Design a binder for this molecule. Structure first.
Ligand SMILES: COc1ccc(CSc2nnc(CC(C)C)n2Cc2ccccc2)cc1
Length: 146
């Protein structure tokens, strides 16, 4: 199919170079250079348990893309033992072909949170990579709170 092939081109030319998370203070809480967007494998991350007590977290995402995108955006879900507890939407917008970009996002928490000791290893963050309405990939990170 025609859309399938375009999605595979975009995936092929895409790379997450690095990321970090700060208290919205700022204070780096987590950082990494592993490309967590790679689909098909379950990635793992260890975050400080005190992140659960932040009102907001500031994220920085550095990525490269050989393909042009008209509307790059993410849909991200927290899954707890298979169950979706919370969802976020983030839009970056237009991406220049063969560009490298730094993206800043403010992530806010919504209800009361289970303890870190209950959550740890039982939380999966699922990220869906879209160009407008075309799904380019799905990736997963399992979280441990340390
Ligand atoms: C296709 O574009 C991308 C870009 C980035 C990703 C990276 S995954 C990711 N992004 N934000 C968060 C945190 C928030 C809960 C949403 N996480 C998960 C996470 C949580 C803790 C430590 C490291 C990663 C995947 C695909």
């Amino acid at each position: 199919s025609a859309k399938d092939e375009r999605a595979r081109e975009i995936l092929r030319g895409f790379k997450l170079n690095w990321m970090n998370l700060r208290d919205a203070t700022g204070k780096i809480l987590w950082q990494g250079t592993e490309d967590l967007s790679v689909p098909g494998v379950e990635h793992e991350a260890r975050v400080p348990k005190k992140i659960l007590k932040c009102k907001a977290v500031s994220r920085e995402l550095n990525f490269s893309s050989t393909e042009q995108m008209e509307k790059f955006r993410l849909e991200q879900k927290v899954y707890f033992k298979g169950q979706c507890l919370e969802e976020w939407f983030f839009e970056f917008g237009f991406v220049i072909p063969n560009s490298t970009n730094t993206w800043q996002s403010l992530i806010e928490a919504a209800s009361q949170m289970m303890p870190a000791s209950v959550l740890t290893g039982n939380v999966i963050i699922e990220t869906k990579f879209f160009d407008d309405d075309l799904l380019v990939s799905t990736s997963r990170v399992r979280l441990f709170y340390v």
